[PDB]
Design an enzyme around this catalytic site. Structure first.
Site, PDB file in Angstrom:
ATOM      1  N   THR A 297       0.773  -1.246   0.000  1.00 42.78           N
ATOM      2  CA  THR A 297       0.000   0.000   0.000  1.00 42.78           C
ATOM      3  C   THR A 297       0.807   1.300   0.000  1.00 42.78           C
ATOM      4  OG1 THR A 297      -1.630   1.262   1.337  1.00 42.78           O
ATOM      5  CG2 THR A 297      -0.103  -0.194   2.519  1.00 42.78           C
ATOM      6  N   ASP A 298       0.165   2.390  -0.415  1.00 42.57           N
ATOM      7  CA  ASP A 298       0.816   3.702  -0.448  1.00 42.57           C
ATOM      8  C   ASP A 298       0.962   4.296   0.955  1.00 42.57           C
ATOM      9  OD1 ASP A 298      -1.872   4.216   0.054  1.00 42.57           O
ATOM     10  OD2 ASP A 298      -2.049   5.891  -1.352  1.00 42.57           O
ATOM     11  N   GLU A 299       0.216   3.749   1.910  1.00 45.65           N
ATOM     12  CA  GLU A 299       0.246   4.232   3.286  1.00 45.65           C
ATOM     13  C   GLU A 299       1.593   4.109   3.995  1.00 45.65           C
ATOM     14  OE1 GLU A 299      -3.147   3.303   5.741  1.00 45.65           O
ATOM     15  OE2 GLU A 299      -4.484   3.255   4.014  1.00 45.65           O
TER      16      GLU A 299
ATOM     17  N   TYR B 284      -1.614  -0.579  11.157  1.00 46.35           N
ATOM     18  CA  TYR B 284      -1.775  -1.220   9.855  1.00 46.35           C
ATOM     19  C   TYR B 284      -0.640  -0.846   8.893  1.00 46.35           C
ATOM     20  CZ  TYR B 284      -3.176  -1.773   4.979  1.00 46.35           C
ATOM     21  OH  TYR B 284      -3.168  -2.094   3.640  1.00 46.35           O
TER      22      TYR B 284
ATOM     23  N   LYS C 220       2.489  -3.110   7.183  1.00 47.61           N
ATOM     24  CA  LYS C 220       2.810  -3.254   5.773  1.00 47.61           C
ATOM     25  C   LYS C 220       4.207  -2.748   5.446  1.00 47.61           C
ATOM     26  CE  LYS C 220       0.658  -4.609   2.984  1.00 47.61           C
ATOM     27  NZ  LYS C 220       0.466  -5.970   2.392  1.00 47.61           N
TER      28      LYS C 220
HETATM   29  N1  LIG Z   1      -7.805  -1.848  -0.172  1.00 51.83           N
HETATM   30  C1  LIG Z   1      -6.928  -1.137  -0.866  1.00 51.83           C
HETATM   31  O1  LIG Z   1      -7.271   0.032  -1.499  1.00 51.83           O
HETATM   32  C2  LIG Z   1      -5.485  -1.565  -0.989  1.00 51.83           C
HETATM   33  C3  LIG Z   1      -4.534  -0.748  -1.713  1.00 51.83           C
HETATM   34  C4  LIG Z   1      -3.166  -1.152  -1.753  1.00 51.83           C
HETATM   35  C5  LIG Z   1      -2.768  -2.334  -1.169  1.00 51.83           C
HETATM   36  N2  LIG Z   1      -3.689  -3.158  -0.537  1.00 51.83           N
HETATM   37  C6  LIG Z   1      -3.258  -4.479  -0.163  1.00 51.83           C
HETATM   38  O2  LIG Z   1      -3.957  -5.374  -0.953  1.00 51.83           O
HETATM   39  C7  LIG Z   1      -4.039  -6.647  -0.268  1.00 51.83           C
HETATM   40  C8  LIG Z   1      -5.538  -7.099  -0.248  1.00 51.83           C
HETATM   41  O3  LIG Z   1      -6.403  -5.978   0.135  1.00 51.83           O
HETATM   42  P1  LIG Z   1      -8.038  -6.035   0.146  1.00 51.83           P
HETATM   43  O4  LIG Z   1      -7.939  -6.671  -1.168  1.00 51.83           O
HETATM   44  O5  LIG Z   1      -7.921  -4.541   0.226  1.00 51.83           O
HETATM   45  O6  LIG Z   1      -7.958  -6.894   1.475  1.00 51.83           O
HETATM   46  P2  LIG Z   1      -9.169  -7.688   2.110  1.00 51.83           P
HETATM   47  O7  LIG Z   1      -9.422  -7.212   3.499  1.00 51.83           O
HETATM   48  O8  LIG Z   1     -10.392  -7.439   1.260  1.00 51.83           O
HETATM   49  O9  LIG Z   1      -8.862  -9.257   2.060  1.00 51.83           O
HETATM   50  C9  LIG Z   1      -7.752  -9.879   2.771  1.00 51.83           C
HETATM   51  C10 LIG Z   1      -7.756 -11.179   2.392  1.00 51.83           C
HETATM   52  O10 LIG Z   1      -6.622 -11.939   2.972  1.00 51.83           O
HETATM   53  C11 LIG Z   1      -7.103 -13.055   3.673  1.00 51.83           C
HETATM   54  N3  LIG Z   1      -6.270 -13.262   4.854  1.00 51.83           N
HETATM   55  C12 LIG Z   1      -6.113 -12.514   5.992  1.00 51.83           C
HETATM   56  N4  LIG Z   1      -5.236 -13.055   6.873  1.00 51.83           N
HETATM   57  C13 LIG Z   1      -4.805 -14.217   6.245  1.00 51.83           C
HETATM   58  C14 LIG Z   1      -3.875 -15.234   6.639  1.00 51.83           C
HETATM   59  N5  LIG Z   1      -3.213 -15.203   7.810  1.00 51.83           N
HETATM   60  N6  LIG Z   1      -3.666 -16.286   5.764  1.00 51.83           N
HETATM   61  C15 LIG Z   1      -4.355 -16.303   4.559  1.00 51.83           C
HETATM   62  N7  LIG Z   1      -5.230 -15.416   4.108  1.00 51.83           N
HETATM   63  C16 LIG Z   1      -5.420 -14.372   5.010  1.00 51.83           C
HETATM   64  C17 LIG Z   1      -8.535 -12.737   4.023  1.00 51.83           C
HETATM   65  O11 LIG Z   1      -9.269 -13.967   4.283  1.00 51.83           O
HETATM   66  C18 LIG Z   1      -9.035 -11.953   2.788  1.00 51.83           C
HETATM   67  O12 LIG Z   1      -9.521 -12.733   1.655  1.00 51.83           O
HETATM   68  C19 LIG Z   1      -3.366  -6.382   1.104  1.00 51.83           C
HETATM   69  O13 LIG Z   1      -2.031  -6.892   1.243  1.00 51.83           O
HETATM   70  C20 LIG Z   1      -3.481  -4.867   1.222  1.00 51.83           C
HETATM   71  O14 LIG Z   1      -2.474  -4.368   2.112  1.00 51.83           O
HETATM   72  C21 LIG Z   1      -5.049  -2.751  -0.379  1.00 51.83           C
HETATM   73  C1  LIG Z   2     -14.534   3.743   7.073  1.00 51.76           C
HETATM   74  C2  LIG Z   2     -14.646   5.256   7.077  1.00 51.76           C
HETATM   75  C3  LIG Z   2     -13.696   5.993   6.498  1.00 51.76           C
HETATM   76  N1  LIG Z   2     -13.715   7.391   6.453  1.00 51.76           N
HETATM   77  C4  LIG Z   2     -12.627   8.124   5.793  1.00 51.76           C
HETATM   78  C5  LIG Z   2     -11.238   7.928   6.390  1.00 51.76           C
HETATM   79  C6  LIG Z   2     -10.302   8.002   5.200  1.00 51.76           C
HETATM   80  O1  LIG Z   2      -9.797   9.322   4.972  1.00 51.76           O
HETATM   81  C7  LIG Z   2     -11.210   7.607   4.041  1.00 51.76           C
HETATM   82  C8  LIG Z   2     -11.031   6.180   3.559  1.00 51.76           C
HETATM   83  O2  LIG Z   2     -11.028   5.283   4.712  1.00 51.76           O
HETATM   84  P1  LIG Z   2     -10.927   3.681   4.524  1.00 51.76           P
HETATM   85  O3  LIG Z   2     -11.933   3.102   3.640  1.00 51.76           O
HETATM   86  O4  LIG Z   2     -10.931   3.059   5.863  1.00 51.76           O
HETATM   87  O5  LIG Z   2      -9.525   3.484   3.727  1.00 51.76           O
HETATM   88  P2  LIG Z   2      -8.048   3.887   4.078  1.00 51.76           P
HETATM   89  O6  LIG Z   2      -7.795   4.051   5.511  1.00 51.76           O
HETATM   90  O7  LIG Z   2      -7.781   5.118   3.302  1.00 51.76           O
HETATM   91  O8  LIG Z   2      -7.159   2.597   3.601  1.00 51.76           O
HETATM   92  C9  LIG Z   2      -7.496   1.815   2.446  1.00 51.76           C
HETATM   93  O9  LIG Z   2      -6.598   2.211   1.370  1.00 51.76           O
HETATM   94  C10 LIG Z   2      -5.179   1.837   1.609  1.00 51.76           C
HETATM   95  C11 LIG Z   2      -4.344   2.369   0.436  1.00 51.76           C
HETATM   96  O10 LIG Z   2      -4.517   3.828   0.336  1.00 51.76           O
HETATM   97  C12 LIG Z   2      -5.043   0.300   1.806  1.00 51.76           C
HETATM   98  O11 LIG Z   2      -3.678  -0.059   2.064  1.00 51.76           O
HETATM   99  C13 LIG Z   2      -5.938  -0.158   2.945  1.00 51.76           C
HETATM  100  O12 LIG Z   2      -5.791  -1.599   3.101  1.00 51.76           O
HETATM  101  C14 LIG Z   2      -7.382   0.267   2.639  1.00 51.76           C
HETATM  102  O13 LIG Z   2      -8.208  -0.213   3.728  1.00 51.76           O
HETATM  103  O14 LIG Z   2     -12.584   7.721   4.487  1.00 51.76           O
HETATM  104  C15 LIG Z   2     -14.774   8.107   7.037  1.00 51.76           C
HETATM  105  O15 LIG Z   2     -14.853   9.327   7.036  1.00 51.76           O
HETATM  106  N2  LIG Z   2     -15.752   7.316   7.634  1.00 51.76           N
HETATM  107  C16 LIG Z   2     -15.782   5.910   7.707  1.00 51.76           C
HETATM  108  O16 LIG Z   2     -16.720   5.373   8.274  1.00 51.76           O
END
Ligand SMILES: NC(=O)c1ccc[n+]([C@@H]2O[C@H](COP(=O)([O-])OP(=O)(O)OC[C@H]3O[C@@H](n4cnc5c(N)ncnc54)[C@H](O)[C@@H]3O)[C@@H](O)[C@H]2O)c1
Ligand SMILES: Cc1cn([C@H]2C[C@H](O)[C@@H](COP(=O)(O)OP(=O)(O)O[C@H]3O[C@H](CO)[C@@H](O)[C@H](O)[C@H]3O)O2)c(=O)[nH]c1=O
Ligand SMILES: NC(=O)c1ccc[n+]([C@@H]2O[C@H](COP(=O)([O-])OP(=O)(O)OC[C@H]3O[C@@H](n4cnc5c(N)ncnc54)[C@H](O)[C@@H]3O)[C@@H](O)[C@H]2O)c1
Ligand SMILES: Cc1cn([C@H]2C[C@H](O)[C@@H](COP(=O)(O)OP(=O)(O)O[C@H]3O[C@H](CO)[C@@H](O)[C@H](O)[C@H]3O)O2)c(=O)[nH]c1=O
Lengths: 361, 361
Positions: A133-135, A167, A171
């Site tokens: 992630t970019d975080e 988190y 990462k």
């Molecule tokens: N959500 C985003 O915008 C975003 C952006 C950049 C990077 N990522 C990365 O993308 C990947 C997936 O993100 P999602 O797709 O956002 O996540 P998600 O929360 O939707 O899914 C996580 C998945 O991993 C599995 N998992 C968790 N712990 C596990 C373990 N110990 N063994 C096996 N499987 C396990 C879960 O069952 C699930 O299917 C992560 O590594 C996350 O850091 C997410």
């Molecule tokens: C859930 C929730 C979120 N928010 C705000 C907080 C953030 O500025 C924005 C997005 O929040 P979230 O959906 O939780 O996503 P964020 O923290 O940005 O992180 C996501 O994006 C990341 C990459 O940028 C990934 O690595 C993470 O796995 C993914 O969960 O919205 C609210 O205002 N209210 C809410 O209830």
């Protein structure tokens, strides 16, 4: 090519699996523990293919993961398994330390031993792709902190790591382990870091899917602080296409930032969703009336923005959607998929909602 | 002030404990698991003081560490406990992941819960000082890679993290957890990163103490590669003085690099030790004849160099020794402390020596 994928039953993972099976000649072995975030229903369209196999397992279970590598003899690995919600990491960090850090370590060790014993040919072509992630880059200066003339900085592959939450610290740590394994043992690894993803099959705990569903159920739309925080939005299907491109053409030891160059303020995203619903599912009053300002997230990062120039000029990747086109597809998808939504929302889900939103901060 | 210190029975830790008891009015509670590297004999001069207490425990044991915090009610924490040898991390990384990453996590959680429940006064003055290394910054350009005119870069507090080994990746991760806990929960943390330490009570596995003792025993002096790699050497007593200054006057949320601005090549350091011994303990032949080139360390970082300008202009710290004065004191110390040397060298030590040096790579 045989690809071993971790976390294929999740949001981004399932998009990757569906893309590979529908649009490529590669095969897939999916390893997923199926936590609250893992859902086999997200892979319904391809679960029957003979080019797909599923293994219910934890990446921390070395013995079982070793057995899986030996059975399928993968040519590459795409590691997406992880705990991904910042809000959950604030109240329950242990799971993030265990799965994201120790889990990556355990997987790196199985992969190293496997890779070291491969034949000359297969050994030189092996690839370990770590999805991140970019975080990990920390926070960026916000528009309201600088001169309305100065150009705001963006995240590049050489930006220094400075994670703000359990988190992102999780990462960032997994990233370091991947690069160190490469420098110390020679494992051909690749790392990608992308902005916020949105779209189909997104678990209802993240901003967009939470807002869409709460709106339709007549519930509050919770805005942390003032909602002036900024995020870079990338459609999940675009990310999936970029990822397969990286594991296939990416260069060992390189890093690639992935995004769509679409900075948006949270409140603005919520208004856009409300206008779309007022249009498609009109009712007595506007959905905007459900918007509510709540206590801010501790340590909240105010602005993320990715510079995807590198992957663009080196691999030629570009997003096909725009936020406008993608956000409409997302809203339409949820309206047409109530079955999937009902199966994912369990009693555990409601417990998380009560914990994070009622009597909030 | 009551200070809780982890790893106080080790090399740098024991120097910190001895300094506090002999030169300040503060008190100390020392928590140490006593691994192969922990030695109570290094604290002989002060173990009887009523201002010192020792607790034999593992930082991963939350229940016991919680009990200890409640019993002594510390005003500050100095975290030095860790697995510190790069060579051991290459063959046995699990211990580094567990102690350095998970252990820091466990300690951070106990400290957070403790700090949150303190009274207004004591809560604002609490300090969590994390002791770290310069290795988290990665490697630096070496003199033989650039123009003999260009100025070589140094490590500063804003240099990007890029750890090369399991050990440095371990520490880099612990650093991230400390800063994230501060940003997310508000815990007043401080981080310090310093160059290679040398001096009294150094365990015989690091370059200098290994070379001194092997020389006196008529054994080989193992040089990894060509011995042209560079390190910044800081006398352990100087580091100790800087550390107490930081925990006492340092600003919460700040980072301070610590070093002596003394870049030296490994081979040169070995020759210096050999000439000192030829002078002090002369024999038939020169000690130089024992110098031996052996297989290089995998992923070896070729050059480290710290820029300690910040801590100098903000806290006013400067090293009292020079490499010349410090290296002579070190050699003299080992010659006068054969008792300590014999007690530290056990059967386990010989097993490590055989493992890392015989039939090497
Ligand atoms: N959500 C985003 O915008 C975003 C952006 C950049 C990077 N990522 C990365 O993308 C990947 C997936 O993100 P999602 O797709 O956002 O996540 P998600 O929360 O939707 O899914 C996580 C998945 O991993 C599995 N998992 C968790 N712990 C596990 C373990 N110990 N063994 C096996 N499987 C396990 C879960 O069952 C699930 O299917 C992560 O590594 C996350 O850091 C997410
Ligand atoms: C859930 C929730 C979120 N928010 C705000 C907080 C953030 O500025 C924005 C997005 O929040 P979230 O959906 O939780 O996503 P964020 O923290 O940005 O992180 C996501 O994006 C990341 C990459 O940028 C990934 O690595 C993470 O796995 C993914 O969960 O919205 C609210 O205002 N209210 C809410 O209830
Ligand atoms: N030696 C250096 O030049 C140098 C430079 C920069 C930073 N550091 C850091 O300084 C600290 C101490 O280094 P040394 O002083 O070099 O280390 P050391 O190897 O001499 O001693 C480590 C100490 O920690 C204890 N320990 C290990 N695991 C433990 C656990 N789980 N619980 C409790 N105690 C445990 C050991 O028993 C031992 O006394 C480390 O955090 C190291 O990264 C060292
Ligand atoms: C043990 C040994 C080392 N060397 C070389 C390798 C290095 O360039 C140099 C110093 O090696 P070491 O004593 O192992 O130290 P190094 O790897 O630099 O790391 C030390 O210094 C670090 C800070 O720079 C600390 O964080 C570590 O905890 C500490 O162990 O000497 C040899 O040539 N031969 C040897 O036998």
């Amino acid at each position: 090519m045989k690809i071993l994928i971790t976390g294929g039953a999740g949001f981004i993972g399932s998009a990757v699996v569906r893309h590979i099976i529908k649009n490529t000649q590669d095969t897939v072995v999916n390893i997923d523990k199926l936590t609250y975030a893992g859902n086999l229903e997200s892979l319904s369209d391809i679960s029957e293919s003979n080019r797909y196999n599923f293994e219910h397992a934890d990446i921390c279970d070395s013995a079982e993961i070793t057995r899986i590598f030996e059975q399928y003899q993968p040519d590459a690995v795409m590691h997406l398994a992880a705990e991904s919600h910042v809000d959950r990491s604030i109240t329950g960090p242990a799971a993030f330390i265990e799965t994201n850090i120790v889990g990556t370590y355990a997987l790196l060790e199985v992969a190293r031993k496997y890779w070291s014993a491969l034949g000359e040919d297969k050994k030189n072509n092996f690839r370990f792709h770590h999805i991140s992630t970019d975080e990990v880059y920390g926070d960026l200066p916000h528009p309201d902190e600088v001169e309305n003339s100065v150009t705001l900085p963006l995240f590049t592959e050489t930006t220094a790591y400075a994670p703000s939450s359990p988190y992102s610290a999780s990462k960032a740590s997994s990233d370091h382990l991947v690069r160190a394994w490469r420098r110390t043992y020679g494992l051909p690894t690749i790392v990608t870091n992308c902005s916020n993803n949105y779209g189909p099959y997104h678990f209802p705990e993240k901003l967009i899917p939470l807002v869409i569903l709460n709106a339709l159920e007549g519930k509050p739309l919770p805005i942390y602080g003032k909602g002036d925080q900024i995020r870079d939005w990338l459609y999940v299907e675009d990310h999936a296409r970029a990822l397969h491109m990286v594991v296939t053409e990416g260069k060992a030891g390189e890093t690639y930032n992935i995004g769509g160059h679409n900075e948006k303020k949270n409140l603005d995203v919520v208004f856009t969703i409300c206008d779309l619903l007022d249009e498609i599912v009109p009712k007595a009053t506007s959905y905007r009336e459900q918007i509510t300002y709540v206590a801010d997230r501790p340590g909240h990062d105010r602005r993320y923005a990715i510079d995807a120039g590198k992957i663009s000029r080196e691999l030629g990747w570009k997003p096909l959607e725009t936020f406008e086109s993608g956000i409409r597809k997302t809203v339409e998808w949820y309206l047409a998929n109530t079955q999937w939504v009902n199966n994912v929302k369990s009693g555990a889900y409601q417990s998380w909602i009560e914990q994070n939103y009622e009597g909030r901060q």
